């Protein structure tokens, strides 16, 4: 299935790895991968099949009290769909800029370029700046000095967001998806371009340095909480778990297949292509270090812009750079567009199933899809302004990643493992797929996953360190509060639902608890 | 898993009722699904019913869907099969088998008890 | 019910000679959901082959299994004196479980 490769792999993993110093990210990344990553991904898919309904309705058949998990999930996809599409706007802008005789980021001789620029080759023939980096910052981004200075709304980027959103609306409205012969090209094209990029990176005259930085752990980094949540939550983000889409995916259709084998096959492959595409990014960074005569830790931005700094450099050192630059962004667009369709479609399905009486009562569903895209487009405008990067960084860290995913993951395992009961869950899976989860799955939900999620959460709070764009910009206090509001918007679902249903139920307290703990309500 | 032993077999008449039992030992009876298999005097094997590990899912053969009731006692580690409308064709030897994993089949079989409805 | 039919009900065999019995299903059966059981005269059946290719704990490597979809069979490299027994094919894909007619090796 195409949704198990995406911008989480080719854009999110390399930047987080680079931000956390590289090889020290891989220790907590693998620990969560098997400890919680795969076991939770199997858990969600079973829930969807077991009920054969949306991510919100299923919990009614498992533990009515904790139905808020479904609400917590649907809000997460709503926030994710707002800022994830912004990456397609940057790719769209790059693609149009690629339709030129010479790529603008190859050299710095234009009006938007600083007087401090020095070409990489001549930089080692001061506080010089590479043309590639400042093209991203000044031309594509026009970075503001801080989040407190929104600046002007970039009209060019606003049109790019409109173009991608329009494509999403028509595709969703008309149900356009890869089902025919085009599936071979759509699925194969990401891996074909990534192999060429990977080969280009390794063959660079300084690839070796980058791959050592990528793989050798600085174990003194593991004494900081940041790398544990960043690594652990990246597993949840990249698997699209805790979003409720996987529950909807299972309910859509599943039969005559071993779900256990499929989930491990999908989950190992999704993680493999992140690790594999890590070499490509770091290999390029290694070469940029020696060419620029600076540390590998400082060559590029320690943020979402890494993918828009490294890969554009790689395409510049290939025969006919324009040809490969075009192919890259029509692979960053198609790989990200298919993902956007799945989560926009899932969000629409999740929302209509709550109020089918009015929205799903007729043709209003078409109007609802336009409304969802419209409001999302307006929300995305905040991240298109000159200071939009700080908003985008804030959204990525908090809106649909970080503690919020841990919050959802902990309750999902806890409810099934202890409240619903592990034995009953294993009993269900026996009926569905014929064999029990086994000790690895049973203990992971019961012990490993709750402990890891809880441990990271406490370890963060005890050793709290505030978010910072790149590695030098400190967010203001109000900005941090806004970020926590986005994360709390999903976490607060579970407690809010619990109290609402405890109040909306008749009888003494204990009767209400017993009634809402028993499934099938 | 070492021992599975059936008991309770005997002679009855048409339209009668009987309760078959199968004690289990050597393994955690609660965590393994149990099934009943029937072997007619012609040596033909016929499936009767199966009960999940926890007893929440119970299934019956078409011939005994509305006549036989399957139950288990996890605390006592004993498997029970109840017949209420035994017919003339119900005479056979009954075996209790462990069927936890569908992809692996019945790992172990009991000694079995003969039932006749003469 | 997913009726399972075994063609060679009776197979007279001499020691050393290889034999093979074919089990046919009236409906689609998964590869992992078909198993073979051996039953010796006056004894309860014992699992022999599962997943259509995997040998049980006690069955020697002498036996092997093959098949998929709607036709399944197992073969014996060299029938020994201890191989004289009745073999039944069973399907687990559908829940109204059905056992094959059974093929009895009389020698
Ligand atoms: N949209 C998601 N939640 N995941 C896609 C990815 O793997 O980046
Ligand atoms: Cl990943």
Give the gap in angstroms from C-alpha C90 to the nearest C-alpha of chain A: 15
Domain ranges, ordered by start, for chain A: 2-517
d(C-alpha C22, C-alpha C5), whole Å: 9
Count of beta carbons in the 10 Å neighbourhood of residue A131: 22
b or e along A327-346 (b: 16 or more beta carbons within 10 Å of the residue's beta carbon)?
bbbbbbbbbbbbbbbbbbbb
| DSSP structure class, residue C91 | E
**Structure-token match 């619990």, residue found:** A498
Is residue A292 left, alpha or beta, with left meaning phi > 0 and alpha meaning psi from -120 to 50?
alpha
The angle, 0 to 180 degrees and rounded to 10, between the axes of the packed helices A68-98 and A321-354 is 160
State the CB neighbour count (10 A cutoff) for residue A188: 10
- Positive or negative: CA dihedral B110, B113, C1, C6: positive
User: Does residue A438 belong to the interface with chain B, where contact is any CB pair within 8 Å?
Assistant: no
Q: Of 1.10.10, 1.10.1760, 1.20.1740, 1.10.510, which CATH number belongs to A2-517?
A: 1.20.1740
Please compute, for residue A406, the number of CA atoms within 13 A of its CA located in the half-sphere on the CB side: 25
- Locate all alpha helices (DSSP H) within A226-306, ordered by sequence: 226-238, 245-252, 259-292
Q: Locate the domains of chain C by residue range.
A: 4-105
The shortest C-alpha distance from A427 to chain B (Å) reads 7
Sign of CA dihedral A486, A487, A493, A498: negative
3 state SS of C106: coil
Cα–Cα distance measured from residue A31 to residue A229, given in angstroms and rounded to the nearest whole number: 12
List residues in chain A that are followed by a break over 2.5 Å (C to N).
125
* Neighbour-count burial of A217, counting CB atoms closer than 10 A to its CB (0-12 exposed, 13-18 middle, 19+ buried): middle
> What is the helix (H) or strand (E) element at residue A340, kind and residue range?
helix A321-354
- Distance from C-alpha of A181 to C-alpha of A235, rounded to nearest angstrom: 32
Query: Following CA atoms A81, A231, A241, A389 in sequence, which dihedral angle do they give, to the nearest 10 degrees?
Result: 0
Angle at A476 between CA A482 and CA A223, to 5 degrees: 90
CB A428 within 8 A of CB A420: no
d(CA A157, CA A162): 9
Separation between Cα atoms, residue A274 and residue A246, nearest integer Å = 20
Q: What is the CATH number of domain C4-105?
A: 2.60.40.10
Residue B5 near residue A402 (C-beta atoms within 8 A): no
Largest CA distance in chain B: 38
Radius of gyration of chain B (CA): 13
Does residue A133 contact residue A117 with C-beta atoms inside 8 Å?
no
Residue with token string 């989860």: A437
Angle (nearest 5°) at CA A14 between A144 and A192: 115
What does the alpha-carbon distance between residue A312 and residue A136 come to, in Å, rounded to a whole number? Answer: 10
Phi then psi for A397, rounded to 5 degrees? -65, -45
Question: How many Cβ atoms from other residues are within 10 Å of residue A443's Cβ?
Answer: 15
Rg (CA), chain C: 13
Is A46 in contact with A314 (CB distance < 8 Å)?
no
Select from C35, C37, B33 the least CA-distant residue to A434: B33
Q: How far is CA A93 from CA A110, A141, A197, C36, in A?
A: 17, 10, 21, 63
One-character DSSP codes across B18-60? EEEEEEEESS-GGGS-EEEEEE-TTS-EEEEEEE-SSSSSEEE
Contacts of C97 in chain B (CB under 8 A): 35, 47, 50, 61
Q: Which residues pair with C54 in a beta bridge?
A: C50
CA distances from A74 to A69, A70, A346, C6 (A): 9, 6, 9, 53
Whether A426 contacts chain B with CB within 8 A: yes
* CA pair distance A24, A30, nearest whole angstrom: 11
- CA separation, residue A57 to residues A61, A503, A519, B82, C14 (Å): 7, 20, 12, 38, 63
B108 → chain C, closest CA residue:
C46
Beta carbons of A210 and A285 less than 8 angstroms apart:
yes
> What would the two tokens of residue A426 be?
């294993």
Handedness of CA A350, A353, A358, A363 (dihedral sign): positive
Query: Is B61–C32 a contact, with Cβ atoms under 8 angstroms apart?
Result: no
Would you call C53 helix, strand, or coil by DSSP?
coil
Nearest to A411 by CA among A33, A62, A32: A62
Q: Are A492 and A403 in contact (CB under 8 A)?
A: no
Pairing of strands C54-55, B18-25: unpaired
- The two three-digit tokens of residue C78, written as one number: 């060299």
Q: Which chains have 3 or more CB–CB distances shorter than 8 Å to chain B? A: A, C
Phi and psi at residue B10, to the nearest 5°: 180, -170
Burial of A362 (0-12, 13-18, 19+ CB in 10 A): exposed
In chain B, domain spans:
3-110
Angle between helices A321-354 and A245-252 (to 10 degrees): 80
Q: What tokens does C62 get?
A: 């002498």
As beta bridge partners, residue C73 has C22, C66
**Total residues belonging to chain B:** 118
Method: cryo-EM
Check: CB of residue B73 under 8 Å from CB of residue B58: no
Chain B segment 9-48 residues within 8 A of C by beta carbon are: 35, 37, 43-47
Cα–Cα distance for residue pair A50/A58, rounded to 1 Å = 8
Distance between CA atoms of B84 and B68, rounded to whole angstroms? 6
CB of A116 within 8 Å of a chain B CB? The answer is no
CA A400 to CA A233: how far, in whole Å?
Answer: 10
Please report the sign of the dihedral spanned by the C-alpha atoms of residue B64, residue B65, residue B68, residue B74.
positive
Sign of CA dihedral C50, A438, B51, A53: negative
Using an 8 Å Cβ cutoff, are B20 and B84 in contact?
no
Burial A462-484 (b: 16+ CB within 10 A, else e): eeeeebebeeebebeeebeebbb
Q: Residue A504 to residues A354, A500, B76: CA-CA distances in angstroms?
A: 18, 6, 41
Cα separation, A247 vs A245, whole angstroms: 5
C33 contacts chain B (CB < 8 A) = yes
Is there a contact between A423 and B53 if contact means CB atoms under 8 Å apart?
Answer: yes
Q: How much of chain A is in helix, strand and coil states, percent to nearest 5?
A: 75, 0, 25
Tokens of A91: 């790719």
The matching CATH number, chosen from 2.70.150.10, 3.30.465.10, 2.60.40.10, 1.20.1250.20, for B3-110 is: 2.60.40.10
CA distance A210 to C9: 69
């Amino acid at each position: 299935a195409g949704g198990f490769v995406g911008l989480g792999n080719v854009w999110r993993f390399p930047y987080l790895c680079y931000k956390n110093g590289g090889g020290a990210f891989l220790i907590p990344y693998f620990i969560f991968l098997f400890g919680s990553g795969l076991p939770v991904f199997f858990l969600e898919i079973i829930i969807g099949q077991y009920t054969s309904e949306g991510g919100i309705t299923c919990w009614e058949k498992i533990c009515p009290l904790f139905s808020g998990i479904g609400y917590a999930s649907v809000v997460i996809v709503s926030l994710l769909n707002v800022y994830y599409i912004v990456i397609l706007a940057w790719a769209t802008y790059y693609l149009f800029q690629s339709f030129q005789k010479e790529l603008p980021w190859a050299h710095c001789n234009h009006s938007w370029n600083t007087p401090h620029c020095m070409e990489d080759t001549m930089r080692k023939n001061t506080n010089f700046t590479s043309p590639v980096i400042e093209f991203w910052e000044r031309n594509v981004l026009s970075l503001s000095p801080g989040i407190d200075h929104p600046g002007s709304l970039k009209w060019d980027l606003a049109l790019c967001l409109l173009l991608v959103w329009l494509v999403c609306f028509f595709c969703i409205w008309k149900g356009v998806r890869s089902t025919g012969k085009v599936v071979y090209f759509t699925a194969t094209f990401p891996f074909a371009m990534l192999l060429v990029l990977l080969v280009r990176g390794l063959t660079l005259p300084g690839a070796g340095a980058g791959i050592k930085f990528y793989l050798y752990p600085d174990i003194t980094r593991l004494e900081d909480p940041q790398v544990w949540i960043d690594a652990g939550t990246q597993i949840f983000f990249s698997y699209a778990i805790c979003l409720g889409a996987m529950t909807s995916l299972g309910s859509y259709n599943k039969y005559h297949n071993n779900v256990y084998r499929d989930c491990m096959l999908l989950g190992c492959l999704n993680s493999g292509t992140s690790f594999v595409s890590g070499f490509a990014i770091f290999s390029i960074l290694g070469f940029m270090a020696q060419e620029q005569g600076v540390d590998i830790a400082d060559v590029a931005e320690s943020g979402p812009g890494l993918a828009f700094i490294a890969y554009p450099k790689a395409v510049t050192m290939m025969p006919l750079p324009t040809f490969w630059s075009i192919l890259f962004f029509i692979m960053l667009l198609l790989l990200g567009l298919d993902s956007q369709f799945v989560e926009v479609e899932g969000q629409i399905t999740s929302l209509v199933d709550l109020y089918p009486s009015f929205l799903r009562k007729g043709y209003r569903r078409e109007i609802f899809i336009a409304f969802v895209c419209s409001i999302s487009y307006l929300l995305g405008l905040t991240m298109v302004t000159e200071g939009g990067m700080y908003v985008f960084q804030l959204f990525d860290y908090y809106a649909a990643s970080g503690v919020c995913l841990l919050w959802v993951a902990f309750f999902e395992c806890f409810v099934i493992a202890w409240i619903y009961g592990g034995n009953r869950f294993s009993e269900d899976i026996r009926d569905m797929i014929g064999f029990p989860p086994g000790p690895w799955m049973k203990y992971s939900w019961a012990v490993i996953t709750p402990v890891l999620c809880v441990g990271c959460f406490i370890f963060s709070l005890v050793k709290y360190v505030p978010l910072t764009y790149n590695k030098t910009y400190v967010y203001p206090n109000w900005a941090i509060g806004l970020g926590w509001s986005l994360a709390l918007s999903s976490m607060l679902c579970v407690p809010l639902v619990i109290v609402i249903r405890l109040c909306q139920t008749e009888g003494p307290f204990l009767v209400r608890v017993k009634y809402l703990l028993t499934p099938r309500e | 898993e070492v021992q599975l032993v059936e008991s309770g077999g005997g002679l009855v008449k048409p339209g009668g009722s009987l309760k078959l039992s199968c004690a289990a030992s050597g393994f955690t009876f609660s965590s393994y699904a149990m099934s009943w298999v029937r072997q007619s005097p012609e040596k033909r094997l016929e499936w009767v019913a199966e009960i999940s590990s926890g007893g929440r899912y119970i299934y019956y053969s078409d011939t005994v869907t509305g006549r036989f009731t399957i139950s288990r006692d996890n605390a006592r580690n004993i498997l029970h099969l109840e017949m209420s409308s035994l017919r003339s064709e119900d005479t056979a030897m009954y075996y209790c088998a462990r069927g936890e994993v569908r992809q692996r089949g019945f790992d172990y079989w009991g000694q079995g008890t003969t039932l006749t409805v003469s | 019910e997913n009726v399972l039919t075994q063609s060679p009900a009776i197979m007279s065999t001499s020691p050393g000679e290889k034999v093979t019995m074919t089990c046919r299903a009236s409906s689609s059966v998964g590869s992992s959901y078909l198993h073979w059981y051996q039953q010796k005269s006056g004894a309860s059946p014992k699992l022999w082959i599962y997943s259509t290719s995997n040998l049980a704990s006690g069955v020697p490597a002498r036996f092997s299994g093959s098949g998929s979809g709607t036709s399944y069979s197992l073969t014996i490299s060299s029938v020994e004196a201890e191989d004289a027994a009745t073999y039944y094919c069973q399907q687990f894909s559908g829940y109204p479980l059905t056992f094959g007619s059974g093929t009895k090796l009389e020698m």
